[PDB]
Design an enzyme around this catalytic site. Structure first.
Site, PDB file in Angstrom:
ATOM      1  N   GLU A  35     -23.244  89.844  23.104  1.00  0.00           N
ATOM      2  CA  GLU A  35     -24.285  90.497  22.269  1.00  0.00           C
ATOM      3  C   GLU A  35     -25.426  89.109  22.185  1.00  0.00           C
ATOM      4  OE1 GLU A  35     -25.711  93.164  21.148  1.00  0.00           O
ATOM      5  OE2 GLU A  35     -24.096  94.469  21.698  1.00  0.00           O
ATOM      6  N   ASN A  46     -36.529  95.272  20.686  1.00  0.00           N
ATOM      7  CA  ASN A  46     -35.956  96.680  21.455  1.00  0.00           C
ATOM      8  C   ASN A  46     -37.101  97.453  21.707  1.00  0.00           C
ATOM      9  OD1 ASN A  46     -32.891  96.249  21.255  1.00  0.00           O
ATOM     10  ND2 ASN A  46     -33.480  96.442  18.990  1.00  0.00           N
ATOM     11  N   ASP A  48     -38.043 100.339  21.133  1.00  0.00           N
ATOM     12  CA  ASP A  48     -38.424 101.035  20.128  1.00  0.00           C
ATOM     13  C   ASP A  48     -39.260 100.349  19.002  1.00  0.00           C
ATOM     14  OD1 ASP A  48     -36.815 100.012  18.189  1.00  0.00           O
ATOM     15  OD2 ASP A  48     -35.535 101.752  18.264  1.00  0.00           O
ATOM     16  N   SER A  50     -37.835  98.009  16.835  1.00  0.00           N
ATOM     17  CA  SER A  50     -37.116  97.519  16.246  1.00  0.00           C
ATOM     18  C   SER A  50     -36.490  95.965  16.706  1.00  0.00           C
ATOM     19  CB  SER A  50     -35.853  98.444  15.835  1.00  0.00           C
ATOM     20  OG  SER A  50     -35.189  98.683  17.141  1.00  0.00           O
ATOM     21  N   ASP A  52     -33.203  93.195  17.198  1.00  0.00           N
ATOM     22  CA  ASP A  52     -31.600  92.820  16.970  1.00  0.00           C
ATOM     23  C   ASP A  52     -31.340  91.334  16.379  1.00  0.00           C
ATOM     24  OD1 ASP A  52     -30.772  95.415  17.602  1.00  0.00           O
ATOM     25  OD2 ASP A  52     -31.099  94.794  19.603  1.00  0.00           O
ATOM     26  N   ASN A  59     -29.270  95.733  14.321  1.00  0.00           N
ATOM     27  CA  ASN A  59     -30.631  96.162  14.383  1.00  0.00           C
ATOM     28  C   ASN A  59     -31.312  96.767  13.152  1.00  0.00           C
ATOM     29  OD1 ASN A  59     -32.135  98.892  15.023  1.00  0.00           O
ATOM     30  ND2 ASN A  59     -32.257  98.045  17.037  1.00  0.00           N
TER      31      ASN A  59
HETATM   32  C1  LIG Z   1     -24.247  97.835  15.579  1.00  0.00           C
HETATM   33  C2  LIG Z   1     -25.774  97.266  16.264  1.00  0.00           C
HETATM   34  O1  LIG Z   1     -26.784  97.398  15.550  1.00  0.00           O
HETATM   35  N1  LIG Z   1     -25.757  97.055  17.495  1.00  0.00           N
HETATM   36  C3  LIG Z   1     -27.048  96.723  18.055  1.00  0.00           C
HETATM   37  C4  LIG Z   1     -27.687  98.203  18.580  1.00  0.00           C
HETATM   38  O2  LIG Z   1     -27.735  99.093  17.229  1.00  0.00           O
HETATM   39  C5  LIG Z   1     -28.811  98.002  19.417  1.00  0.00           C
HETATM   40  O3  LIG Z   1     -29.296  99.451  19.969  1.00  0.00           O
HETATM   41  C6  LIG Z   1     -28.582  97.017  20.309  1.00  0.00           C
HETATM   42  C7  LIG Z   1     -29.888  96.688  20.969  1.00  0.00           C
HETATM   43  O4  LIG Z   1     -30.025  97.427  22.420  1.00  0.00           O
HETATM   44  O5  LIG Z   1     -28.256  95.920  20.068  1.00  0.00           O
HETATM   45  C8  LIG Z   1     -26.794  96.123  19.473  1.00  0.00           C
HETATM   46  O6  LIG Z   1     -25.924  96.698  20.258  1.00  0.00           O
END
Ligand SMILES: CC(=O)N[C@@H]1[C@@H](O)[C@H](O)[C@@H](CO)O[C@@H]1O
Ligand SMILES: [Cl-]
Ligand SMILES: [Cl-]
Ligand SMILES: [Cl-]
Ligand SMILES: [Cl-]
Ligand SMILES: [Cl-]
Ligand code: NA
Length: 129
Positions: A35, A46, A48, A50, A52, A59
């Site tokens: 991650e 992202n 969308d 949002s 991370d 997110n």
């Molecule tokens: C639990 C959490 O928030 N994990 C996030 C996911 O929500 C989000 O879609 C992604 C980006 O592509 O990053 C992480 O995987």
């Protein structure tokens, strides 16, 4: 802060992620590696609109407030900025909220694609815990 592998396993164990909802420590260390590359300061926008945030790339569409994701939720009741700290408390406590939410660690795409059904124990091999 960029964590070392055994440094992060110990901080994660200290904060009660070892076998939280049946997910061994290896799974949380494997997920952090792919991650964030163990970087608490990781941010990724992202498609969308949002963003991370932090070691586990939580997110802003559901979990935290960055004040720039219109019609999003703050289910962990934190500024996303809280997730970038050297102290991983905020990221861990929110991660417990997420993994409990029905899909477990499948909420982390990197976990499902790179850690799930693998020898995640290798991630804590060597460490004093
Ligand atoms: C639990 C959490 O928030 N994990 C996030 C996911 O929500 C989000 O879609 C992604 C980006 O592509 O990053 C992480 O995987
Ligand atoms: Cl590593
Ligand atoms: Cl493990
Ligand atoms: Cl917002
Ligand atoms: Cl910490
Ligand atoms: Cl589960
Ligand atoms: Na939000």
């Amino acid at each position: 802060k960029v964590f070392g592998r055994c440094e992060l396993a110990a901080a994660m164990k200290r904060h009660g992620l070892d076998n939280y909802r049946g997910y061994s420590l290896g799974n949380w260390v494997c997920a952090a590696k792919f991650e964030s590359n163990f970087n608490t300061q990781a941010t990724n926008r992202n498609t969308d609109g949002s963003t991370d945030y932090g070691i586990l790339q939580i997110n802003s569409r559901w979990w935290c407030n960055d004040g720039r994701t219109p019609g999003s939720r703050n289910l962990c009741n934190i500024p996303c900025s809280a997730l970038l700290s050297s102290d991983i408390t905020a990221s861990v406590n929110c991660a417990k909220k997420i993994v409990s939410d029905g899909n477990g660690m499948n909420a982390w795409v990197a976990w499902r694609n790179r850690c799930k059904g693998t020898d995640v124990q290798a991630w804590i091999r060597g460490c004093r815990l």
